[PDB]
Amino acid sequence: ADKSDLGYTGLTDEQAQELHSVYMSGLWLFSAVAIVAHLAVYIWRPWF
Amino acid sequence: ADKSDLGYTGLTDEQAQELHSVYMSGLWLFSAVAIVAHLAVYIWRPWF
Amino acid sequence: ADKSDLGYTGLTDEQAQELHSVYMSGLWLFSAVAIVAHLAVYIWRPWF
Amino acid sequence: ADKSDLGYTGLTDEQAQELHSVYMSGLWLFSAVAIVAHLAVYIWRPWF
Amino acid sequence: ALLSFERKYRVPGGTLVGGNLFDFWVGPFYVGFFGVATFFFAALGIILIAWSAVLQGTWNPQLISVYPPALEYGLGGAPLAKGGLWQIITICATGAFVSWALREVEICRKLGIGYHIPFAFAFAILAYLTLVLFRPVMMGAWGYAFPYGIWTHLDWVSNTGYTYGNFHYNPAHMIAISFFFTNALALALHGALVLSAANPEKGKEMRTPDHEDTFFRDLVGYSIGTLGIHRLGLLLSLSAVFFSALCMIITGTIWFDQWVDWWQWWVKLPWWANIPGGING
Amino acid sequence: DLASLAIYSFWIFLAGLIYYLQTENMREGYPLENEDGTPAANQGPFPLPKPKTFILPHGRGTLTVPGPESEDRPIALARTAVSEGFPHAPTGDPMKDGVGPASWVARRDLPELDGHGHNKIKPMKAAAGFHVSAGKNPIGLPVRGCDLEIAGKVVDIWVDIPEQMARFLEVELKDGSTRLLPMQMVKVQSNRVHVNALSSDLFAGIPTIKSPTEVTLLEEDKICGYVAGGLMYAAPKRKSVVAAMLAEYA
Amino acid sequence: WMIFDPRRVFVAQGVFLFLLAVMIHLILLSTPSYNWLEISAA
Amino acid sequence: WMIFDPRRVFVAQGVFLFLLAVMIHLILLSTPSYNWLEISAA
Amino acid sequence: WMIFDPRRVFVAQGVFLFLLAVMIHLILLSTPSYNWLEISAA
Amino acid sequence: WMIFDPRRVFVAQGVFLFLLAVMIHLILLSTPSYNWLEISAA
Amino acid sequence: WMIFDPRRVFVAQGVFLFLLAVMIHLILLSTPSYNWLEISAA
Amino acid sequence: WMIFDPRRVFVAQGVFLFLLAVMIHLILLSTPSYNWLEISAA
Amino acid sequence: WMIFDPRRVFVAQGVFLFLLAVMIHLILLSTPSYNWLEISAA
Amino acid sequence: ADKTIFNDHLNTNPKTNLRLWVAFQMMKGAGWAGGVFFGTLLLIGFFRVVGRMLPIQ
Amino acid sequence: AEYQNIFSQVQVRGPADLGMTEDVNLANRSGVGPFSTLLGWFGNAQLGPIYLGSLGVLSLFSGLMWFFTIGIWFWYQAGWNPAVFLRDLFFFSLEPPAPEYGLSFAAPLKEGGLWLIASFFMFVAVWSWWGRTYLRAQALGMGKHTAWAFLSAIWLWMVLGFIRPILMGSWSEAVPYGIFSHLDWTNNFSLVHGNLFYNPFHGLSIAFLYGSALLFAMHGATILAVSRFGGERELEQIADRGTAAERAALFWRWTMGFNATMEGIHRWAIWMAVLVTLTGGIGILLSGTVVDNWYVWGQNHGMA
């Protein structure tokens, strides 16, 4: 049966194990992977 | 748990620890941080 | 059937049995199927 | 259950909570900018 | 957003094998398993109005053109804007025609309204195909096709449509027009067969399907009912296409000659063979 | 007139015709309501119009439309996602609470009227118009459900006059407690019937028509909606049903 | 009813002022005198 | 009050400023004066 | 909270970026004057 | 299973590499100035 | 009775001085003889 | 009944002042006499 | 008692005054022999 | 005979796959055929199956 | 002989019943028309009755001498044999008074004769069958919309050989009579006027015939699709909203992005109707007294 409070579902403790391990890790496993890959993209080839 | 009437849902604190905690991620990473992209812009290149 | 944790699912240790053989070696030997081919197409005959 | 007769809402005293939170102040400073971001542009570039 | 009675109808599934992984209702629109597919198809497709806007010439969809390949290059590719880049637009178009008529089934199996709708777009699937696949695979190369535009394929159908003399002599074409002017022949009285009973002239009591049987039996001598003219709209609107895809599946690939020269296969009969009669005589 | 004039009394007088037309199709249904009974997000760029007076065909009142829109009838979906978007699931079994694929509504107790002073849909033992009196005549044969097993025996026809048509196929149970079932889904070939919707042990769950001769417009909602209830779920998951529900042609 | 609120400003109003802005620009960006974008050299 | 997010802010609202942003990155590339990276060869 | 984690957090990023990256490539290929293989054909 | 292994990547990735394979066959096998197998006559 | 009143004798009294008025104004302006709002240079 | 004004002045007569405005503007621009505020050139 | 009366008087009254004049107007409006509004100076 | 959960079986020798399966279900797959997978096959599939020895010169 | 009861439709026939009675008539409609009971299990099966008054048979006669006038100009060249008639049931021809005659009816039988009669009679056949759909919706208590999509339909008939060939003044400016003669005429108004592609009044009328099948490919589908429920009865689905405005009113909004009222689905369907030959009548009243060569129209009001 469905419950009540904040917030469901779910699922404490899963504010820092579910919505931060596969949610805030995206702000890294590609957001910074852009910054390194752009060192081989930004200069090819806007300068002829 | 089901609801009935205005203006759920809603509601709280499914609105307080949720809706307050995700909308500013779309209203800051694009509101004032979008003026951090204005850096390499406001001078490059409106003035020739 | 499902658990609650992370990945769960998962599903430890099938997260590392069904995402090791066809996922890891999946993007590894495809990096040996698509990339090793590049080395004979870069120049024959894009150089014209 | 929903609501009763005309109008609800309405309603007195429920006409000024959501028709006056992003519908009155979200238009007056939009009009102020129609005065502010317009009066500084009431001079360039008509005159060469 | 959702309607007032849209309360009980909300239930997950509809999709086949895999789960409810893709079926999230983005707004008033349905994003089932073929929902994000069309999201993938509609996003790339707006760029296909803009690609040959730097290769062919103009940037406005007035004269934007990604031409079909040439006639003789064979069973293969093309240049680019003049075929190659044209060769990519179709499988999106058609790949988007398909991901739409079949995302309806994720609603059809979802509820229980009938499967005669993954079908009335499949006479549109079998009407755009007859100009992109059905023709130019056999006579030489993919060069036997039309341009995608809105004013380019115009001066392609007229001043470039008299290859077969006149196309009115094309009998099924003209029967697939003996089928087309009849579509709004039976939408014009059926779109007004439910209008004027609660709004008769103003105030009067509403009519029932017995006044329908004293208005249309008081019209044109044939009253197949009210379920005989939804079997009289889906009879006006799907078939003017298979009598046109048959006006062209034996036109050009077998008859690239004057179809005005087809109406001399009728005057040739042993009875009145050596006989010039009227006009002809 | 001129070469540049008439295309402007059109970019204007008709540029709001998708606008004026849409609202006239947005009478019923609207306003938009949330997933509980709440003044919802909004309506749209073509909001619903305030309705005009509607006169009814057999004096059924001042039923203006859009009309009743609130929560009169019982609904039973356990809200999985309290957020508006992600779907909801019934309580026990979905074919008892009446939620999902099987839909109905609560109406007034006056059945559909024609103009003769009588009701619309009646059996063949309520209209001695056309009968059986030549050769051997088939009105009485056994049937089969979606479970691929015999379901009952249909021996009658609900007649029609204005359309000269049919709407139901009445089933004589072992007992006699009434049951009903739609008309277009059916797929009969030779000497036995096959329905591919409901199993042959879920036919009593179809309401007994309060009268075996009358169908009130109140009743004509679940009676042709329970079969739609079995066009969504049916049937998880393995074996015979996979060679029954899927594939096929017609 | 009639006029609600909390959905128009998120996905509709942002493209209403923008829609009120777009059919204005491509004429004043292309008037016989104005433009104010391309011309900055001569 | 009202309104919805947990569904919208993951696959819905992201294509609103995406409907505002990438629809005009193209344009600043069509002009033969702005461009900002196009005119490189010459 | 809510949304998804075991369902729609590894797939709202797979074909979503494929719906924003690999079809964004077709803009930097709508070039034939730049282009990483059409430089020679100019 | 976080991602779906025998679903999203057993017959849906075999056409996902089929996704980027043949659409480019009508660009690189195309091009108005390459070919290098067709023009064995001119 | 007769026809609509709180519907037809008000909101349709517009096209009396609109659709009628517009396509009669259009002609008496574009005529080589009228103009009236064009005479100034003398 | 049979008519409205909560929709005939909230967003009907309220667009009876913007729709009935810019209509003659580009047409009194089409009539070669007005302009009336173009000092940039002359 | 066979046809109508109320309808003809408010709406079918037009096919006697208007759609009998407005079409016969543009006939005697285009005629030089009358002109009135095309009199001016000729 | 029954698992109670649904309407089939695990294994067992007789009774199960005895005269079901290839008896009732895909009986339409062949009756519909002989005209669709046989009638659209007289001037197309043979159009490309003779090419093997003849065009080889 | 008995009427049977076969397997899966189903049907039951009708004894002796007509419709309704108010402002119609009693002793005019003929005997109960014989019923076509021949596998009539699909739709309906009932011939008669018919309002055979002077408001309908004025078109049976005025159509018949529209039918016989070009008729006695379809046997005129054959050779007086029944061999050449059905041989050239189409190859035969007949044109109106020449592109130089016009306002005078002084023309004899030959060069351009039997054009002046067919239409003259047809003139009170079409116009006397505009009002067999406009007043038989008054014999009960319905509306007039049925011939207001028809006043729009005889708006294209209001220009072809009526309003333009009299102001301008000639009968060749009307349509030749036959079965091919006017097909060598639909492409005439094409090329003489410099092609009517840049004539988006003839072309939007087109554009209003490409929305008759974007509007009835699906109506004939879904009303047949939500009929297992109760959407076939279009006379009890609007003011008392049934579940057919639930399987067909949630079905399209999810799909293309909007649905419609059970009444409003007949408000668009008659808006892609009173706008086909209406935008055709204008876009053919704007062709011949505006800009002939429409290629010399659509490059000065189009690209320029």
Ligand code: BCL
């Ligand atoms: C020389 C002039 C000739 C002539 C030139 C041609 C040419 C050329 C053609 C025809 C074709 C046809 N002609 Mg012709 N034709 C003439 C004039 C006419 C007239 C007339 C009364 O004037 C009529 C009624 C017709 C009717 C016909 C049909 C027999 C046939 C139409 C097939 C078709 O369109 O289906 C096809 C159906 C579709 C394409 C719809 C498919 C829908 C798809 C799946 C969805 C598309 C979505 C879209 C991309 C998205 C847009 C929506 C946005 C989201 C807003 N022709 C004269 C006699 N005609 C065509 C034909 O016979 O081949 C089949 C054809 O090529």
Ligand code: BCL
């Ligand atoms: C060069 C080729 C041009 C072109 C050349 C032309 C020419 C020339 C014309 C058209 C016209 C039209 N074109 Mg075009 N057209 C092109 C492309 C097309 C295509 C397409 C290929 O997609 C189609 C389908 C059409 C078809 C159409 C129609 C949309 C339009 C006229 C409608 C009509 O026929 O009403 C006809 C209906 C009527 C006239 C009303 C009939 C009702 C009558 C009054 C009732 C009679 C009563 C009688 C007694 C009943 C007796 C019945 C008995 C009981 C049995 N064109 C290309 C671009 N086309 C026509 C037009 O008007 O342009 C707008 C026209 O002249």
Ligand code: BCL
């Ligand atoms: C079949 C013979 C000719 C032909 C004969 C005609 C004739 C005659 C006409 C058209 C017209 C049109 N043709 Mg064509 N057309 C052909 C090929 C096609 C094909 C195809 C790929 O097979 C399609 C899908 C279409 C359909 C179209 C539309 C683009 C356009 C208006 C359709 C309409 O109003 O009716 C109902 C259809 C709709 C309401 C759908 C809307 C279609 C719109 C215009 C297309 C959307 C493109 C859009 C601008 C791109 C947006 C993408 C991003 C948002 C930027 N044609 C062939 C080559 N076609 C009409 C026209 O002139 O256009 C204004 C017209 O009169």
Ligand SMILES: CC[C@H]1c2cc3[nH]c4c(c3C)C(=O)[C@H](C(=O)OC)c4c3nc(cc4[nH]c(cc(n2)[C@@H]1C)c(C(C)=O)c4C)[C@@H](C)[C@@H]3CCC(=O)OC/C=C(\C)CCC[C@H](C)CCC[C@H](C)CCCC(C)C
């Ligand atoms: C005999 C079949 C008739 C028919 C039936 C029909 N059309 C239908 C349907 C049905 C039942 C729908 O259910 C569906 C609909 O939504 O209802 C209107 C539809 C439809 N008919 C449409 C258009 C249409 N149908 C047409 C014709 C016909 N439709 C036939 C007459 C025509 C013409 C005039 O030929 C047009 C223009 C769409 C509005 C809609 C199809 C909705 C759909 O499937 O969307 C998928 C598309 C995308 C996701 C976009 C991706 C595509 C690419 C990105 C670009 C495509 C390139 C291409 C060249 C486009 C160019 C368009 C024009 C410039 C030609």
Ligand SMILES: CC[C@H]1c2cc3[nH]c4c(c3C)C(=O)[C@H](C(=O)OC)c4c3nc(cc4[nH]c(cc(n2)[C@@H]1C)c(C(C)=O)c4C)[C@@H](C)[C@@H]3CCC(=O)OC/C=C(\C)CCC[C@H](C)CCC[C@H](C)CCCC(C)C
């Ligand atoms: C909005 C545009 C669409 C449209 C609308 C439209 N058509 C309409 C109408 C409307 C509103 C009608 O009200 C009217 C109608 O009643 O429909 C059934 C009609 C109609 N449109 C028709 C056809 C038609 N529709 C067309 C198309 C269209 N009509 C568009 C799709 C066209 C074209 C493309 O030009 C035609 C030709 C007819 C079915 C009908 C016209 C009814 C009519 O006027 O006929 C009068 C009756 C006669 C002339 C009887 C005489 C019969 C013969 C002439 C004599 C020979 C036979 C006789 C029996 C001899 C035998 C002797 C006996 C005595 C034994």
Ligand SMILES: COC(C)(C)C/C=C/C(C)=C/C=C/C(C)=C/C=C/C(C)=C\C=C\C=C(C)\C=C\C=C(/C)CC/C=C(\C)CCC=C(C)C
């Ligand atoms: C065995 O054969 C028998 C003996 C039975 C006779 C057969 C006869 C035949 C062959 C009949 C064939 C009829 C057919 C098929 C005719 C086809 C007609 C077609 C395809 C189109 C006709 C369209 C109608 C047109 C072009 C009419 C145009 C006329 C107008 C638009 C207005 C005319 C108005 C006029 C002339 C003014 C008259 C009015 C006044 C007030 C003077």
Ligand SMILES: [Fe+2]
């Ligand atoms: Fe209808």
